[PDB]
Amino acid sequence: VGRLIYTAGGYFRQSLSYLEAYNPSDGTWLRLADLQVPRSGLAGCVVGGLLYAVGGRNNSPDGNTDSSALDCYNPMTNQWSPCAPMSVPRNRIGVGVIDGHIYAVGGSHGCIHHNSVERYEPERDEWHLVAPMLTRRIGVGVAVLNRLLYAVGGFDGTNRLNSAECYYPERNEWRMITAMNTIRSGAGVCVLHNCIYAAGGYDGQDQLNSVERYDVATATWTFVAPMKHRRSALGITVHQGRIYVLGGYDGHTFLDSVECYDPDTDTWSEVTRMTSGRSGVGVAVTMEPSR
Numbered sequence: 001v002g003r004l005i006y007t008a009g010g011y012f013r014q015s016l017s018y019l020e021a022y023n024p025s026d027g028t029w030l031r032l033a034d035l036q037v038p039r040s041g042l043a044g045c046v047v048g049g050l051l052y053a054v055g056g057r058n059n060s061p062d063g064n065t066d067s068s069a070l071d072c073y074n075p076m077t078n079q080w081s082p083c084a085p086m087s088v089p090r091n092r093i094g095v096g097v098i099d100g101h102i103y104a105v106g107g108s109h110g111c112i113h114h115n116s117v118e119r120y121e122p123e124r125d126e127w128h129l130v131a132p133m134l135t136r137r138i139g140v141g142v143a144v145l146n147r148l149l150y151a152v153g154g155f156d157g158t159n160r161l162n163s164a165e166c167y168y169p170e171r172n173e174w175r176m177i178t179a180m181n182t183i184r185s186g187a188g189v190c191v192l193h194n195c196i197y198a199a200g201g202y203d204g205q206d207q208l209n210s211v212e213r214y215d216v217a218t219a220t221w222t223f224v225a226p227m228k229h230r231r232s233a234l235g236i237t238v239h240q241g242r243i244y245v246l247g248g249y250d251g252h253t254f255l256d257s258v259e260c261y262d263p264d265t266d267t268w269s270e271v272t273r274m275t276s277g278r279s280g281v282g283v284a285v286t287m288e289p290s291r
């Protein structure tokens with residue numbers, strides 16, 4: 001069965017409830033069941049074919065609230081179902097999946113900038129706290145490489161960060177690694193062909209279009225081709241060997257641009273436009289819905 005790029009939530013004037021899924025072959029955007037609660041600054045991931053929306057914040061004209069929620073979308077039913085929530089609300093969260101468990105990393109709750117990390121077990125619908133990061137990180141990018149969890153960049157409440165650190169699940173321990181060339185908060189971070197990519201973000205002066213890639217073998221970050229559009233708070237995912245970046249904010253506009261990175265040619269190209277511009281979406285890939 002074919003797989004689609006799902007985008008959940010996001011922000012434009014207020015937090016959004018949209019769930020839409022892009023088909024890179026036929027170009028369509030499918031409109032699917034709304035999130036129960038509008039949320040921006042959330043993360044998406046997929047475990048066992050189910051799409052999970054984690055954390056975020058409901059910015060609404062009636063009031064704003066960070067979210068601890070975990071919700072699960074089933075493409076086979078086009079229905080959302082709530083899960084047990086996290087221990088704390090986490091706006092501008094990063095997540096990664098290791099051995100079928102969801103790791104929720106960093107984020108903010110009001111003025112609290114989290115270094116804490118917690119792990120979700122779907123088979124028991126339970127969260128448990130694990131060792132905290134060495135650094136408080138909101139707008140942190142998260143990727144998993146060889147069953148290690150990497151936390152990249154972010155904002156500690158005062159400084160934006162180029163530092164990255166690595167979580168060893170069986171040691172329950174974080175270790176600093178080589179820092180990125182570029183300070184980035186709200187970057188898109190993902191894994192492609194055994195490398196971690198960090199694309200875009202904000203360094204406290206400019207939104208960024210540069211992209212760099214970490215090689216665990218050489219413990220080095222290297223720049224690759226930059227994106228066409230500078231963007232912070234972008235969504236990112238991998239589909240059939242290519243990176244997709246969705247939306248974001250460029251200092252002036254909430255973007256609807258979607259760009260696609262081909263690693264074999266080291267080229268970015270714009271492939272579609274979202275039905276409306278937005279930042280702060282959660283993005284992941286899974287099977288197309290049934291009908």
Ligand SMILES: [Cl-]
Pocket residue numbers: none
């Ligand atoms: Cl609507």
Ligand SMILES: [Cl-]
Pocket residue numbers: 042043044045235236281282283284
């Ligand atoms: Cl995401």
Ligand code: NA
Pocket residue numbers: 043044045094095096283
């Ligand atoms: Na994610």
Ligand code: NA
Pocket residue numbers: 014015016038058059060061
């Ligand atoms: Na809202």
Ligand code: NA
Pocket residue numbers: 139185186187201202232233
């Ligand atoms: Na940012």
